Amino acid sequence: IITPEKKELIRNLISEYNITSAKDLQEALKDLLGDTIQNMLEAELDEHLGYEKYESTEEAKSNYRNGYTSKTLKSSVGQVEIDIPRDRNAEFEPKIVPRYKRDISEIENKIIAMYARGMSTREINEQIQEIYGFEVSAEMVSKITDKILPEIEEWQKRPLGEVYPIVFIDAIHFSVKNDGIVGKKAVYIVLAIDIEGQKDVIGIYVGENESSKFWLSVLNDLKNRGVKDILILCADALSGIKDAINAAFPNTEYQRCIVHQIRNTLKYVSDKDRKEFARDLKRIYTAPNEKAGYDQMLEVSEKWEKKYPAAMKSWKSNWDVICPFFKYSEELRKIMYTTNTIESLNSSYRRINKSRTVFPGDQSLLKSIYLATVKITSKWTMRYKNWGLILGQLQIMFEGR
Amino acid sequence: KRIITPEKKELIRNLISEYNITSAKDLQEALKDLLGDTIQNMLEAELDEHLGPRYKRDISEIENKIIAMYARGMSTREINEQIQEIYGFEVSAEMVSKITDKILPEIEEWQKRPLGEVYPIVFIDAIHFSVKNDGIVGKKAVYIVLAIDIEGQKDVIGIYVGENESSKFWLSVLNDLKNRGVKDILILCADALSGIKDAINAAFPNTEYQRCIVHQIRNTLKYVSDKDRKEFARDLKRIYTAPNEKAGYDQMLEVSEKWEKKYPAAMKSWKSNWDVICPFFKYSEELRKIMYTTNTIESLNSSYRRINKSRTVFPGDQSLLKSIYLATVKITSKWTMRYKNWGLILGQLQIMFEGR
DNA sequence: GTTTACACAAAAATATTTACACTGCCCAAAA
DNA sequence: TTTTGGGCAGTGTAAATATTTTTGTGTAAAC
């Protein structure tokens, strides 16, 4: 795609700017960008005033141009200086480079993508100064990433699908400066798999876990747009969620989250060197029926009563909520006990917010979490394996859906 | 002021007509799509100009940016993406290596810079070895020699590599230091093994100095667990806060009796080396603090870890030296601040070594 | 006669700096 | 022995803060 006219243009620009090396070529690149912008601005001024430099007009020329004024631009190649013309009454408006605009490059989206990757504002400042030439302070990075706040509000009011077969609820704790004191806030991510087998984060909510109805409030938000029943929801049983869903979504079959149970009870305080009893814990959720699952749970409890005893106690306490997991098919069971669909989420946030220790205000935390969630969900075009079969099993197990 | 010529006016007009330029981004992408391959070919021809210091080739702006990205530990795909986004052409890993090869005369000048005659304190530290390849693999180790001089500025003096415990390697290091201009070292701290005794007694022996403190703690707590290192940290904190040397001996015997059943073979070495560690307590509290701070060593180790993760790609015969030099200069650029309460330390050093 | 360039300030838009209010993370240590 | 404090090193960003650009208008030079 090399046009001979482009070749002649290259030869002419090499001849006019006297390019003899690569350094000369880059200097001439900067000079050529500046000259082109200045020429276009002079053409725009000629179009605005309606006459060229020093040319008479029959009608009384209402306003005279009165020289140039300097301005330094921030471009992709580097920092360039140009001279822009000016009208006496200051009526002319530049088109390519508008008034007071010096960051003509399109680095905004790149800065936002770097901040979503987990880079600090000062890290981004140093990186941009090193690999671009011009300076962008940390507060400038903050004001640039503030531009997606209407996007955040539209994502919070984003219209969701009608039916969601499987839902997961996860919690991630951070520190937040509220009312002048730094306390602690837990952010709850509501992820869901749709009818086609595609998982996509549907909700992100700031916790404020002082009251229980706030939890219910989240469901009410779903009641605002997710008006259909959820065939299965998987949440870490905490803070009186049972009453919330049973009064909001009573049709939903509420089971204890298997992977959250594994994370919270058998591994919160676990012997690090021999964590590999999940291979036997698989024996619990690879059982055909719930009675065999209870028997294998008793067996592994007998196996693990030598270590700290409080591990298997939670299984005995919550088996009443864990029992509906066995009614599902093996392909359905797979979706339950796969911690990789949950851990990979949490760890991802952990690997994104590794450098952000304390978030000033709720909205900064919300910005960072929305950016991380978008960066993660961008690659989530893969559908679920053996889906459609799962849809048939769902419609058989739930005849009215 | 830029007075433009009518021929350049026609050039700009033809450019705008060819690329249909209406906004600034249109102009930038037009310049990219027009000059990408041109810049690529010019760069490859200018780097292959020798085979296609006395003669040090000049560096370009884009080459300086590539050097900066090389120092930041960026992946080859990532720097390729950045260059494609800015200038509009691809850079292969071999091109990256050929571009980075241009800072070698700078490394020569940095390794041959004239030094002062007397340096109060000198440390030599070792880090892990990402072995270079010219047909062999090595058991050798990377050493950085950093010294604090009569004033209060810290600066890395040398970067060396060798057989790691031959007396000849240490002797060559000290002889290079003496050739660069050094004539007497007041305090030297090296990794305690063979060879350094003879190297000191044959290279810089105004007085014997085997004062090793930060080297001993790391050498003894390397073969222990980080979970217990905090308890080891508390016990060694009790060990280095002793006012007298005999109190330090008592604390050492106590911690050895406490830890000889969980890790018997480590602290034994300490006892075996206690004859050498004794003169450390002769210093005042300030000299002790300046010695065992190790914060600069930890910063250097973190930079070298960022280099070992991402920069060990090409032959380290020049690449390892480039990476270490870039990390050291990145530290020393903003590492020019003077030292804390250096005047009292200087008085104590001048009274402690009076015949200077 | 006109037209534009240039030079001073003052206003306005923008981007840098300071200041949090902490979190981690080492120690120098007391009860 | 475990619990305090005390620097240091980070963070995102509100609020003073400095900087750069644009403007008002008066001249000096140019067409």
Numbering used by the authors:
A (entry chain A): 6 to 406
B (entry chain B): 4 to 55, 103 to 406
Lines from the paper:
The PRC structure captures the binding state before the initial nicking step on the donor TIR, where we observed TnpA interacting with both the donor TIR and flanking DNA. Furthermore, the primary mode of ID motion is consistent with the motion seen in the comparison of the two complex structures. The structures and the iMODS analysis suggest that the relative flexibility of the ID and CD domains may be key to a conformation change that transiently places the transposon end in the trans‐active site of CDB.
Copy‐out/paste‐in transposition is a major bacterial DNA mobility pathway. The pre‐reaction complex (PRC) is a complex of TnpA with DNA representing the first 26 bp of the R‐TIR with six flanking bp (fR‐TIR26); the pre‐cleaved complex (PCC) is a complex with the first 26 bp of the R‐TIR (R‐TIR26); and strand transfer complex 1 (STC1) is a complex with oligonucleotide R26(j6)L15‐5′rec in which a 6‐bp bridging spacer links two TIRs and is an approximation of the Figure‐eight intermediate. In each structure, the R‐TIR is recognized through an extensive protein–DNA interface in which almost all of the interactions are contributed by one protomer (“A”) with the exception of the transposon tip which is directed toward the catalytic domain (“CD”; residues 165–261 + 325–407) of the second protomer (“B”), suggesting that catalysis occurs in trans.
